[PDB]
Design a protein around this ligand. Sequence first.
Ligand code: ADP
Ligand code: ADP
Ligand code: ZN
Ligand code: ZN
Lengths: 266, 518
Amino acid sequence: DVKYQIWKFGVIFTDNSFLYLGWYMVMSLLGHYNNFFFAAHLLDIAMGVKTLRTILSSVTHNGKQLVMTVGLLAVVVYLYTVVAFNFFRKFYNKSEDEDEPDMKCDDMMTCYLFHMYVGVRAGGGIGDEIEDPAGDEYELYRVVFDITFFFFVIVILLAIIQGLIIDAFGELRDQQEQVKEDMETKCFICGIGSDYFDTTPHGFETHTLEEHNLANYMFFLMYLINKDETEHTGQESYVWKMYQERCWDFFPAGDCFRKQYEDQLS
Amino acid sequence: PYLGRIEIMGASRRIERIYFEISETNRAQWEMPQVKESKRQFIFDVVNEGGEAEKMELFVSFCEDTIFEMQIAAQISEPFWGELEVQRVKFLNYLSRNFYTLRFLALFLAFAINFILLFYKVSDSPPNMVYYFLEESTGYMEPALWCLSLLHTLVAFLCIIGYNCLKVPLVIFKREKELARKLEFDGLYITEQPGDDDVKGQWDRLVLNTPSFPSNYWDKFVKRKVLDKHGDIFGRERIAELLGMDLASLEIDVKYQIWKFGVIFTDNSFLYLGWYMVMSLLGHYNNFFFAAHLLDIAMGVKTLRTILSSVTHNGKQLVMTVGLLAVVVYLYTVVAFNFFRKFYNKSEDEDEPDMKCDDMMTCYLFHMYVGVRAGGGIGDEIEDPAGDEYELYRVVFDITFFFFVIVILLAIIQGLIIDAFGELRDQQEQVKEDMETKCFICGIGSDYFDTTPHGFETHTLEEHNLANYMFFLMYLINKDETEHTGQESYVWKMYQERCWDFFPAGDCFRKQYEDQLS
Ligand SMILES: Nc1ncnc2c1ncn2[C@@H]1O[C@H](COP(=O)(O)OP(=O)(O)O)[C@@H](O)[C@H]1O
Ligand SMILES: Nc1ncnc2c1ncn2[C@@H]1O[C@H](COP(=O)(O)OP(=O)(O)O)[C@@H](O)[C@H]1O
Ligand SMILES: [Zn+2]
Ligand SMILES: [Zn+2]
């Protein structure tokens, strides 16, 4: 069946894990061409180690926010670059030798490159790099320039990144806590809270382990699938029909054996 | 689908079901994404900073604003003086329809222009005055920039016009509605009088006498109603002259335009668009003014605006923390100016000393400029104190500066931003939790309705749909009063009296007829 084989191969080749393993095989081939391609397999620790993957989830949880924050930093550095290129061209000379000047803000492209490369990697901003403004008619304007750069880009715009990562840690933690709290508070199948079943000691534990075990529901589906239809009992056939019709009305929703026969049992 | 149902508390003092027809146009307008976003914003605002006392008043006002917006959208939707008028109205409708696409186009043009401006240079010689010329090998970039600047100014003007034709009517409608309510139910200009410090009320004083005071507001009888309410106490001729009404004609507009223009020019979004147009004009004078349009990304991109909300949430705390840093650096400056003047010499050459703490002004400037931008504080900059009688005092000086200013006073800023992230997150979570736990209209929790499977979902989708309440208000407003049924007239009267006692509060059809249904 060549048509079915082609379809299956397309589906397989559109699969992310298979593509990752193929990339692993490709870099392993290229290692023989140049052994240092084997360093691209160290990145497999992120996919392998669950601790590393969980740590990197803090980075990737707010990934779009991080990208937008980097773009915002790029925009604001462009604004500072424009202001420098129009008013502070003299201070950007990075040559001690007077034989040749090396002014780095006589072009918008090179001044933006200089800003994005040194002003954001400097601890004090661009004023760490450029000429001292003391004894100049633009001294107050240039100290405002430098200190606003330091406040907005160095402090605020990296505090945003750190806060995004910290908030990712906290958000993932509270997501896990909320999942655990919901699971241990209400029954998965029927939704009745543990407060109802706790009237009987260990009532919720008994109900979830025995009465409404999702493992038991999975095993019953296995039983139905692997049992011949001719030998299904009445209730087995009823569930089999409801399953073939994709109607999940045989799952007890908000009701249980205890709640139904409370009058008789008590 | 077209059959909407709501529950009200009727004249029989029990919950009742009202059935009415919903138009497909109105349903589509409700499903529109902008209307959905406005609804979500209203829900968040009310749940975060609202209470039960005024929640229904706020909800009714929101419904009225939504109805007016739907009317505007329906009007602008597209199916010798006459020809030019048809051309003008068609053009204005096109602008109103494509306002948001024009705003996106203006943002794209700003990005294109600012990318072109990255090929700029400065030259002393023409291509001691300096010459600014855009250098590019191909040379098509100069005509591209010229045409892009012209097109950008045109698009900004078109954005202003589209705003004036699309969003201004809602501002005027809200203004007139609020004035009518506070004039008829509070006697704002009949008994209370404005406080003379409310510029809003003082300027609204100009529109009472106008022959066309309500023009977007659909309450045509506002003047007659306020006259009937306040005449028997405050006279009738006085009320008639206040409202510009002729009593004789009751039985058997440059002033309004000025008031509307003042209200429009006091509007923040219109002022921002005017500033955009002004900087677009100044771009032709000096192309680099087009870099002030990059700031429009904050107003445009929702992701960027949400990120910047972390900065602006604790803005006053940030400003106060900067002022505190300034005060403490002043204290350190005073201590330096009195005890450590020698160490602040910033000249290697012995020919001339450059001591930077022989004046309080220059020492404060030096501290605020270098000690807070240095990683180790002021001791990174000033002379080493080793082998001096003030060595211990000066190491205490430097290390206290490093601890308090460098560490503590920037950790405060970072903690303010992080706490802003967390606080906004928990605000969103609390709003979602409240909305999914209790019914918006009646307040009965989901625990009650969950006894029936999918009971809360059924109740919120069908029994107490706030969308259904909004649609019923549309139905009442657009239906003639003579053909109102009994319950429709009851709700219409309670609505005209601004009494929200027909909203079922703590009661529902299920809770009322539980005995009979079970
Ligand atoms: N229908 C359900 N079936 C099984 N466990 C349930 C169900 N509803 C709630 N739970 C709860 O799920 C939790 C999972 O614990 P357990 O069943 O021991 O599995 P595991 O430790 O592998 O997660 C228990 O506290 C249990 O009470
Ligand atoms: N009176 C109400 N009308 C509508 N939704 C309500 C009401 N009270 C609570 N809700 C809840 O509001 C939530 C909003 O979801 P939904 O109605 O699908 O709208 P959307 O997804 O656009 O926010 C639902 O979980 C719903 O149960
Ligand atoms: Zn259960
Ligand atoms: Zn309700």
